[PDB]
Write a protein that binds this ligand. Sequence first.
Ligand SMILES: [Ca+2]
Lengths: 223, 30
Amino acid sequence: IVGGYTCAANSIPYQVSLNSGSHFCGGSLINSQWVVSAAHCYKSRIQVRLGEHNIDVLEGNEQFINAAKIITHPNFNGNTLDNDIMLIKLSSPATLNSRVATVSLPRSCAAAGTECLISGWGNTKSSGSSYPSLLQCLKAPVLSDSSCKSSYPGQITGNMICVGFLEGGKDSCQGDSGGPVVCNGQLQGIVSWGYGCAQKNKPGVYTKVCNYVNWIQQTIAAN
Amino acid sequence: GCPRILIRCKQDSDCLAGCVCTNNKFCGSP
Ligand SMILES: [Ca+2]
């Protein structure tokens, strides 16, 4: 997250870190036993870390739970990043408390202009690298489809939304992928991709969660 | 277009499509 601020500890209780030796993607807890992330974050083994704030230091509220099943959208395309969504079934349910909690799926898609909260442990610089220990937070609005497509000609599908600032300076970045975009208490986006970070007229592009609510339901029903 | 996954790298081939291995040995946009 470029241009954001340090979140209050454990104040984003649905945030998870996906770990394979070290942090590499975020995710969102949507059920005590299910996490949603980006399909490009797939690995065949993943440790899900809940209740995290400082990813480098154990502070006492973390839960470390291995993934039992990892399921990418069957029409995910690694070249266009269309359908960039993945479900993870935890090997046991998380214990829910004030520091580990679920977030709701959307009842409807978010309108342009809706204000959202983005979070993660990704790079905080637009040029160069600074990976933080502490969870970062960012308020940003959903942009209209036309501005989105105008920023990224021929690259935006019906399953993608742009969230951010056309003037640049504030955005998600490498290491934030799979993380949540929460608007009015509903998960509306998943950090997916962009051209650089926080660049002018290149806002972040996010998986449009509201198009996948049925897919998620049916996948869980089969597992 | 480069996905916002954190990958430590040595060569461009360690990165996903759209990214390059940059000066700090992380995948990113060129
Ligand atoms: Ca910690």
